[PDB]
Each structure stands twice: as structure tokens, then as C-alpha cells.
């Protein structure tokens, strides 16, 4: 039994400029589809789907438009994140859910660890408890592949992979956040029926001991998604810690896995500020500066 009655599949799309990783991503699409656990039903009549107007980079680069297929008129016409995120909160209450008895599900750590946290620094919104614990479905998927036996996967995204492996047709268009959500809900549902144990497996914590030793800087990092990741890790206050299925307990919402304080008192402030990175303004980190991490 998965211990949540209802699972919320979330995906964002953001602003980007492909060849440049020192980029202050802003949310441009915010999508959710609800999943009924005891009933095993994807409920796509219980949705959230909004576009979002960025403030830092108002014009979407052509390559971003290409990736996401989101046309510029759709963002010009949208509200800013603070407004949209507010609508989100109202919509949540609409669902009459029991605090801590529902979890978000994403295709990776990107959506909540990186995207949501950063956007929320910008919009100056404290990160809520239900974003500080979630189900990284792809990680679960790695385990399911061990159990059920490896397979040759030519697909190129986390979703693509899971759809290929589970032998599921692609829903709609890649990188539309809602379409991404629909693929993940289907994947999740097939996963549960094939025997996957689905719980919270990632927690956002204020502190990790691998951040005490300054990071081995790598000059060409703004051209590598991996290496950018490593610096994203140092800059963002909250870092992803993992947790074994059998170790998770419902009542961990919403206390910090490291410092055990409440999530209205933890992460108002970086606990391992990477001063070592911020000391040479011959090569400064752009996304850290506009966000105001220094």
C-alpha cells in the first residue's frame, strides 16, 4: 500500500537558453493532474494548468519556444508567478485534502529541487512543506528495472525512458507540462500495477555534509548540464536527501530531515553559503546574482 490517498503529478516548464546553463529559469507553465490511490484512477478532470509571464526574461528565446512549443503570445497574456502560485493554493483548498495525506510526484528532482525552489526565491515565497517532500518517480523506476530486468533504452528523457520501458504510447507532445503530467500519471499507474512501491523518496533539507568542502570549480560549467547541476547544488539553500521506502513516515511532513525544526522556521536562510564560489567577479555566477544569493 502506498500511504497517500491522493497523488499530485506536477511538472513545470521554464524559460531557458539551451547552450547556457547560467540561466535564471523562470516558470512559464505550471501543470498538475490528480491521482486517486485507493481507486486507481487518473482524474484528469481535476487539473491545474496555467501559463506564467516571467519578469527577468520576458521574451522567450527561440530555442525555448522550440523545446516547449509554448508561443510568446501565450506568455504575454499570462499572470506572473506570484499570482498563478496563489491560484494554485486556492485550487488546492478546493480539493479538500487532508494536510500531509497527499504528495507530489515528479519526473525527476528538477521540478521541485531546482525549478520550484529557485522560482520561489525570485517570487520571494517561502517554500511550502508539500514541496519539501515528494515522489521522484524516475528514481523508483531505476529500482523497478533492477527487479524486473534491464532493457536497452534509446529514448532520451526520463519520461521517454519510462514510457519506452513500460511499453506505453506517448501522450501528446513532449515538454508541454500538462502533456508531461499525463504521461507521468499513466506511467505511475502502470508502475503501481506492476508492483512498484511508491512513497515519498526525496526530501529537501537545509544541510548536507558534502557541502562543507568547497566545490571543485570547473570553468566550462555553463555548457554542461551535469556540472551546472553541481553548482546549482551549492547555490540553492535546500538540497535533496534520499530516503528508503520502509523508512518514510507520514508525520515527517513538514519537519526538516536534518535539523528537525518546522518548515516555516527552516530554510528562510542558506545554512552552507558557498562563499568560496562568490569571491571572483572576473567569473561571477549570474543566476546567483539576479536571484540575490549574493
The neighbour count for residue 124, using CB atoms within 10 Å, is 8
Residue entry with cell 526565491: 121
**Beta-carbon contacts of residue 167 (< 8 Å; ≥ 6 apart):** none
Is 106 marked as binding a ligand? no
Residue entry with cell 501522450: 171
**By the rule CB under 5 A, 259 interacts with Zn ion:** yes
Of 158, 134, 106, 115, which Cα lies nearest the Cα of 13? Answer: 115
In this structure, the dihedral spanned by the alpha carbons of residues 184, 189, 195 and 199, taken in order and rounded to 10 degrees, is: 70
Residue pair 208/202 in contact (Cβ under 8 Å)? The answer is: no
From the list 40-48, 126-134, 157-165, 277-285, the region that binds a copy of itself by CB under 8 A is 277-285
Would you say 134 or 293 has its CB closer to Mn ion? 134
Of 254, 222, 35, which Cα lies nearest the Cα of 126? Answer: 254
Among 180, 183, 184, 187, binds Mn ion (CB under 5 A): 180
Among 8, 11, 182, 240, binds Mn ion (CB under 5 A): 11
Question: x-or-dash pattern for a copy of itself, window 8-47, by CB under 8 A?
Answer: ---------xxxx-xxx-----------------------
Would you say 22 or 79 has its CB closer to a copy of itself? 22
Residue numbers belonging to the annotated binding site for Zn(2+): 206, 256, 259, 266
Residue numbers belonging to the annotated binding site for Mg(2+): 11, 13, 180
Residue numbers belonging to the annotated binding site: 11, 13, 180, 206, 256, 259, 266
Q: Residues in the site for Mn ion, rule: CB under 5 A?
A: 11, 180
Amino acid at each position: 500500500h502506498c500511504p497517500f490517498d491522493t497523488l499530485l503529478i506536477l511538472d513545470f516548464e521554464t524559460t531557458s537558453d539551451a547552450a547556457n546553463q547560467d540561466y535564471p529559469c523562470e516558470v512559464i507553465q505550471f501543470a498538475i493532474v490528480a491521482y486517486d490511490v485507493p481507486n486507481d484512477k487518473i482524474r484528469e478532470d481535476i487539473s491545474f494548468n496555467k501559463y506564467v509571464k516571467p519578469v527577468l526574461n520576458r521574451t522567450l528565446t527561440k530555442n525555448c519556444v522550440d523545446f516547449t512549443g509554448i508561443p510568446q503570445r501565450s506568455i504575454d497574456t499570462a499572470d506572473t508567478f506570484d499570482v498563478v502560485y496563489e491560484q494554485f493554493q486556492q485550487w488546492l483548498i478546493t480539493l479538500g485534502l487532508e494536510e500531509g495525506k497527499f504528495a507530489f510526484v515528479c519526473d525527476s528532482r528538477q521540478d521541485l529541487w531546482r525549478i520550484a525552489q529557485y522560482q520561489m526565491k525570485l517570487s520571494n515565497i517561502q517554500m511550502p512543506a508539500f514541496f519539501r517532500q515528494y515522489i521522484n518517480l524516475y528514481k523508483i523506476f531505476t529500482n523497478e528495472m533492477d527487479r524486473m530486468g534491464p532493457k536497452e533504452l534509446s529514448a532520451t528523457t526520463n519520461i521517454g525512458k519510462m514510457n519506452e520501458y513500460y511499453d506505453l504510447p506517448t501522450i501528446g507532445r513532449a515538454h508541454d507540462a500538462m502533456d508531461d503530467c499525463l504521461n507521468i500519471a499513466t506511467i505511475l499507474q502502470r508502475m503501481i500495477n506492476m508492483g512498484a512501491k511508491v512513497t515519498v523518496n526525496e526530501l529537501l533539507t537545509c544541510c548536507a555534509s558534502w557541502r562543507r568542502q568547497p566545490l571543485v570549480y570547473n570553468k566550462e560549467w555553463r555548457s554542461s548540464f551535469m556540472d551546472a547541476g553541481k553548482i546549482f547544488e551549492r547555490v540553492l539553500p535546500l538540497v535533496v536527501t534520499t530516503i528508503r521506502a520502509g523508512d518514510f513516515r507520514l508525520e515527517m511532513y513538514g519537519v526538516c530531515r536534518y535539523c528537525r525544526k518546522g518548515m516555516d522556521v527552516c530554510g528562510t536562510s542558506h545554512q552552507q553559503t558557498p562563499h568560496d564560489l562568490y569571491k571572483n567577479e572576473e567569473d561571477p555566477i549570474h543566476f546567483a546574482k539576479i536571484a540575490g544569493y549574493y
